[PDB]
Amino acid sequence: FKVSARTLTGALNAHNKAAVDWGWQGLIAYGCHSLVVVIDSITAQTLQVLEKHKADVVKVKWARENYHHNIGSPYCLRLASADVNGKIIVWDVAAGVAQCEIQEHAKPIQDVQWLWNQDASRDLLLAIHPPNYIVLWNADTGTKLWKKSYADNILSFSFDPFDPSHLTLLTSEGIVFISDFSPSKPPSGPGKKVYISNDCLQLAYLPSKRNHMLLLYPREILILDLEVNQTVGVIAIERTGVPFLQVIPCFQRDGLFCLHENGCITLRVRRSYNQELTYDLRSQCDAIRVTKTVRPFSMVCCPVNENAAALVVSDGRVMIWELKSAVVSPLYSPVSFCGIPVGVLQNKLPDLSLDNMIGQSAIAGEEHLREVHLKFLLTGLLSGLPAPQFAIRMCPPLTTKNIKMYQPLLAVGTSNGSVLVYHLTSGLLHKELSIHSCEVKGIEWTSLTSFLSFATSTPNNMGLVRNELQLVDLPTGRSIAFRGERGNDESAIEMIKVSHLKQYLAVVFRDKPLELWDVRTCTLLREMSKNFPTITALEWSPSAREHFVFTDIDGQVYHLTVEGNSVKDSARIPPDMGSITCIAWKGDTLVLGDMDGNLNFWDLKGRVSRGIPTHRSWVRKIRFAPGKGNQKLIAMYNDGAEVWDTKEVQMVSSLRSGRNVTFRILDVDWCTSDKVILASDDGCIRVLEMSMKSACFRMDEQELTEPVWCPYLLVPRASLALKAFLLHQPWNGQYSLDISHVDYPENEEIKNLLQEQLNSLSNDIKKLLLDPEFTLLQRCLLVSRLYGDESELHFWTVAAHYLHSLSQSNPLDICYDVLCENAYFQKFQLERVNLQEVKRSTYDHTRKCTDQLLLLGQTDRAVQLLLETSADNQHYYCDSLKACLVTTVTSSGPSQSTIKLVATNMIANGKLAEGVQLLCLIDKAADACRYLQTYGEWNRAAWLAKVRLNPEECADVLRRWVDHLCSPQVNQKSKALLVLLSLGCFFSVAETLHSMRYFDRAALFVEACLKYGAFEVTEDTEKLITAIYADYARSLKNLGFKQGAVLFASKAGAAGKDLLNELE
Q1: CA separation (Å) from 943 to 208, 211, 825?
Q2: What is the spatial distance between Cα 178 and Cα 134, in angstroms, rounded to a whole number?
Q3: What are 934-942's contacts with CB under 8 Å, separation 24+?
Q4: Residue 623: which of 660, 593, 595, 664 has the closest Cα?
């Protein structure tokens, strides 16, 4: 029965309103009063608690994982936190030790967020320093990069998911836009500022629609369009409804998660089946009770599957919700499962992720099917310690007569009237029972499965107080009265004592004589007479003759003996210095505590006293350490606790509040012979060592009732090996998920760790893995989903979709933009320009709408819009001439040389937009795209090539864009890879993947292409395949996995013979 040091959390504080985050690793972290707690959602149990901050935690943000993982960059957990004092700590949650400290000024940190662009460096952090300072930090060495100051009060900021160089700020005046964000130089100027026409609640971008963001209001939700700076969608609640509190967008599908003031969560999905954007409510949960002391703070959602939500409320309760599908605007099931379409006889898992529950986006009012209904279910619940002022007690110490059934139980009393039972080994709450109707004053144990507790009611105008005494047996939970029915007119009870052998019991009142009881018989034995000294302290003798001693208000020490019903007196002691408030007895030493702060070390062997003043204020309670020959006591004062020694008088360690520790001590106890338990005033219970020195709790040595699936807790050499084992499932004929069938010469401990990690997977995941018809692409997608990585998650979906499309409507979702088809993109652009045209307001918008329509191909509706300029505007002649020209220039065969010359001259002189517009207007978009690319506007050129142009001319433009994206001054290789995959050039993708030392993603891509028939093994393409196979085999050999290494070396051919010469 080993006990490890640990801490237990309770209620939350007002400063922890927005301290919670759900990262891609699958763990949820929230901020306690001064601690960070990491919990799991699948099993709902606490895993690791971090305690180093000296102030309240205000922000917790998980790290981003958008980079290739290898030996140099293995899978690790990284956390960042901020406090009120203005300190930022970078955490490595595997042992409890920090890696970086950042502090500037003495003001609270208002916003912390990582950078998603990790192509070059993955240790960049941006934080806001009040009042107008923004600093970009480094998470590796804590070195400042640049500092920029503004002339406003920045509240929050968000990053553009599509353009890394775009950043926006929310100020008390308006919104500030930055378009020159870079880690090398600070922003040039203040940027473009606009004024909204103060009480905004949230500002975030929309990851589903480009150039879209939302503004949160208590009664309204606004969708804003960037290129027109106009509202295109309003989400409003009914007249009698609950105001909004928070909103969280989604990426896989166009949806929003909304949190209300009453604790309700609603899901809204964009309408696509039967002018402004409309979001229809789909699912709703059940509201929780709202009280002046209990209120929800904020909610989080899973960023990987977007099918689970977590809610945090003030009292420490965590609720986990799940979204389920079953078979207003209708919704239909997806066509492709795990990246590829499936039939009607294969196993399916619609609840695996959100994208597998509903279909892709569509335009309402267009000609086109199983209905899908979504509902919310509560499957998790976590509870913590109640309000402060606990009352704790420890189980009887472990002797050699009860080793078989000993269990280290802990009893904690609260003001609600309930008693909490803990285990202290696994850390889980064992039992919770409601006993009393008022605050519990004391808890004492009578056996290993029973204890006693008492409570008092509110005194009246005279002083008489109702007394309650209940005996509780833990396995059954029964509660019965001990004294009986004594009425509600009696004096209160100060203290109760149970003898060492659990035989007798004493009850002490304010002005009532002492009473002696029997635990087994539950009958009275003897009641003291009226002429009895007042009781101020009492203690038994841990030595059926049992002895107990007590003192009076004067100071005289009285020693009495008990044997059955007869009670006699032993001896007397001369008075000795003020009034005694606590007595402790063990062995032959007796210790007395006084008001002034003096401890008299009386020893009943030589009649000698040793008074050692503590120079403190007042002594509350003292208790000795369990165990024979263990002469140690802990003394509780009004400012802290101290550990002493009764053999040699010398203080061992001290803990003073305000000088050494930041919190107070409300109760002390003895867990084991070498550990102590301290109760804090903030609602925390800590188990510390001899010196009460804070330790670093490590997740490696921790016993858990239920295994937790987390590859990040394993060694770097194990996660990659497990990934390789899972990817190539068909080992040596049969299918199995145990290590002991494949050749893998490593130590037994890591093998057992891998086996227990595998055994914690869900039944449906295991069944999907054990499917002969589950193709390699689906396996790769499932592995990417399980590991929580984003790079492969984005790569494999697009790769599989394009491979299946080219091998042979199911279109790609619009969340990829330039990675979609021409017609699907063109339809969305037409819808967007129609929305823009609907809500034109002034002359500064009609011109822009006409310009957009003149490049989207609409020629008939642009002439009519042009013929509307007023007769007083100075541009009437220009607009009329342009309209007439557009009407008469519909011929493209003859008389086009001079028009092209004029366009080229206008482009050369500086006017580029007009020249490009005219060139696209007459007969040519490729030349306009070339000129746009020459001047550095790559995004508009790519958009133009996607809208117009045949799929034979856009290929060259996109290849040039990819080549530009590969420049060392940009470092955007992932986007170039995605565009190359969209272009259907698999050989170039494989070559550039091999050039970037991606030894696994290239081999998997080659295998997938060979299976799907993209390129054959000819006399020219065999060298690259052989080199990739040899490199992957070497990489697998470097990890200790010999089976995959030899399997790939066999297929390598003539470049793997040397590797096989040393493998075997």
Answers
A1: 17, 13, 10
A2: 13
A3: 937/912, 938/964, 939/163, 942/818
A4: 593
* Sequence-distant (≥ 6) Cβ neighbours of residue 988 within 8 angstroms: 980
Give dist(CA 470, CA 284) in Å, integer. 44
Type and span of the H or E element at 597: none
**What resolution in angstrom units was achieved for this structure?**
3.3
State the pairing for strand pair 46-50/57-62: unpaired
CA distance 315 to 293: 8
Burial of 961 (0-12, 13-18, 19+ CB in 10 A): buried
Which residues, in sequence order, are bridge partners of residue 841? none
Method: cryo-EM
Nearest by Cα to 958 from 972, 975, 936, 970: 975
Q: C-alpha angle 1040/1044/1045, rounded to 5°? A: 65
Phi, psi of 714 (to 5 degrees): -85, 170
Region label for 789, one of left (φ > 0), alpha (ψ between -120 and 50) or beta (otherwise): beta
Counting every residue, how long is the chain?
1064
Peptide bond into 131 cis (omega under 30): yes
Beta-carbon-side half-sphere exposure of residue 994 (alpha carbons within 13 Å): 20
With CA atoms as reference, report the closest residue to 263 among 378, 403, 410.
Answer: 378
Cβ burial, residue 273 (10 Å; 0-12/13-18/19+): middle
Identity of the residue numbered 576: D
The per-residue b/e assignment along 279-294, b for 16 or more CB within 10 angstroms, e otherwise, is beebbebeebeeeeee
Quick one: which H or E segment has residue 594? strand 589-594
Element containing residue 786 per DSSP (H, E): helix 776-787
Q: Are strands 504-509 and 493-498 parallel, antiparallel or unpaired?
A: antiparallel
- Number of CB atoms found within 10 A of residue 912's CB: 18
- Are 547 and 541 in contact, with CB atoms under 8 Å apart? yes
Q: What percent of the chain is helix, strand and coil (3-state, nearest 5)? A: 25, 30, 45
Q: How far, in Å, CA of 107 to CA of 1040, rounded? A: 51
Measured over the CA atoms of residue 212, residue 213, residue 217 and residue 219, the dihedral's sign is positive
> What whole-number distance in Å separates Cα of residue 145 and Cα of residue 218?
38
Query: What residues have CB less than 8 Å from 404, skipping those under 6 apart?
Result: none
DSSP label at 825? H
CA angle centred on 626, ends 621 and 628, rounded to 5°: 130
| φ and ψ of 324, to 5 deg | -125, 150
DSSP string, 232-263: EEEEE--SSSPPEEEEEE-SSSSEEEEEETTS
CA–CA distance, 587 with 755 (Å, rounded to integer) = 51
Closest CA to 585 of 537, 553, 545, 641: 537
Nearest-angstrom CA–CA distance, 959 and 941: 12
Task: Look at residues 375, 355, 228 and name the one whose alpha carbon lies nearest to residue 302.
Answer: 355
| Residue with the two structure tokens 């107008």 | 132
HEC string for 828-895: HHHHHHHHHHHCCCCHHHHHHHHHHHHHCCCCHHHHHHHCCCCCCCCCHHHHHHHHHHHHHCCCCCCC
Q: How far is residue 619's CA from residue 644's CA, in Å, rounded to a whole number?
A: 14
Query: Are 4 and 701 contacting, i.e. CB atoms less than 8 angstroms apart?
Result: yes
10 Å Cβ neighbour count for 445? 17
**Exposure string for 484-494, b = 16+ CB within 10 A, e = fewer:** eeeeeeeebbb
